[PDB]
Design a binder for this molecule. Structure first.
Ligand SMILES: *[B@@]([O])(O[C][C][O])C1=[C][C]=[C][C]=[C]1
Ligand SMILES: [Cl-]
Length: 363
């Protein structure tokens, strides 16, 4: 019958449309993996000015969802014995020898517990090897490594950069030549080809100023990925089924499904952040709130790494000045979703769309 497809469209429309109107989102793509099948729902405009509609192939900036790709490359380095999570950071970049990175682990960098590395590089640090070098050489922790989580692009960016160093190639090259092809991703880019630019959505800010992400230090590692809803769902499906990949990449994905500590309801993995499932919408919003991004929190370390599988929701938000993304999946239910928009709209609203969809699929 047509009832299931009609029901799914009705559910996704009912979840998405009021939130798009309420946050004046010009265009939004949803992709859902359900019972081993992909489903796409596209809304609105990729560009208000030329009238290009969103499709499942439209490219959006995914911001910090890029950190899950960065974690997958690090997973590869780790499970190939090129690095270990307890290595000191300076083991992998001689320029950092003699700095405070002699006493900071790769795990600390990956999980934002190095001791107060900030949300962003200061404006004074441009996309320049020497300026990035000099930034880290001069940095000092605010509190003991391993004690407080402070969400940080310089932190996990350095983790990614060191993972690439451990593999002997530039991060950007490894992603394009190895990681994206291993995951089967042909619509996923750090640097969108000229031939694909027609697919790149416009981003919109205050007063609808047009905003696409510019170059910045460790941009590739932290927030560099542009992808389509269809490709990002393929990446979600790889996370749901790492066993469908060749074993070296399966292991790499598995390494991003291990939790190291808790803050409140959230368990921190490499890239991914996990919750018990089910949990209330308000608790999931709290985990994805502004204070979780901007303020330090004392961690509760786990006695050993915890498998992030079964009845858990793994998620990540991502933002750039013009874009807002959210990905969530439930390993034990073989369920995944992607929500990509061309406005940076509040995380709570992203989570509200996802939760309405997940609730509807349950009920
Ligand atoms: B990233 O998009 O994280 C915010 C949404 O969780 C991000 C963080 C810091 C700098 C650039 C991008
Ligand atoms: Cl930054």
């Amino acid at each position: 019958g047509e009832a299931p497809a009609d029901r799914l469209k009705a559910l996704v429309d009912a979840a998405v449309q009021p939130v798009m109107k309420a946050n004046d989102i010009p265009g939004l793509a949803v992709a859902i993996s359900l019972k081993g099948e992909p489903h796409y729902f596209s809304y609105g405009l990729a560009s208000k000015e030329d009238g290009r509609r969103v499709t499942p192939e439209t490219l959006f900036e995914i911001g910090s969802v890029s950190k899950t790709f960065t974690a997958t490359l690090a997973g590869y380095a780790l499970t190939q014995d090129k690095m270990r999570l307890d290595d000191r950071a300076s083991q992998h970049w001689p320029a950092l020898q003699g700095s405070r990175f002699d006493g900071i682990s790769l795990l600390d960098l990956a999980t934002y517990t190095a001791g107060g590395l900030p949300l962003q590089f200061p404006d004074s640090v441009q996309k320049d090897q020497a300026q990035i070098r000099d930034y880290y050489r001069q940095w000092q922790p605010t509190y003991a490594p391993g004690s407080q989580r402070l969400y940080s692009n310089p932190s996990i960016g350095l983790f990614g950069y060191l993972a690439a160093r451990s593999l002997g190639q530039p991060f950007e090259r490894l992603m394009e030549q190895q990681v994206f092809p291993a995951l089967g991703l042909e619509q996923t880019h750090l640097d969108v080809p000229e031939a694909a630019l027609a697919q790149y959505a416009q981003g919109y800010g205050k007063d609808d100023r047009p905003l696409r992400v510019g170059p910045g230090p460790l941009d590739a590692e932290g927030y560099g990925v542009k992808t389509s809803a269809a490709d990002l769902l393929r990446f979600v499906d790889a996370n749901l089924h790492p066993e469908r990949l060749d074993r070296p990449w399966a292991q790499a994905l598995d390494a991003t499904h291990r939790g190291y500590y808790k803050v409140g309801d959230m368990t921190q993995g490499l890239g991914w952040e996990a919750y018990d499932w089910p949990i209330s919408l308000k608790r999931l919003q709290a985990g994805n709130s502004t204070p979780m991004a901007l303020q330090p929190h004392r961690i509760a370390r786990l006695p050993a790494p915890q498998a992030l599988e079964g009845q858990r929701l793994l998620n990540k938000t991502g933002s750039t000045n013009g874009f807002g993304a959210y990905v969530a999946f439930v390993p034990g239910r073989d369920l995944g979703l992607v929500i990509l928009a061309n406005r940076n709209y509040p995380n709570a609203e992203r989570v509200k769309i996802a939760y309405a969809i997940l609730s509807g699929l349950e009920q």
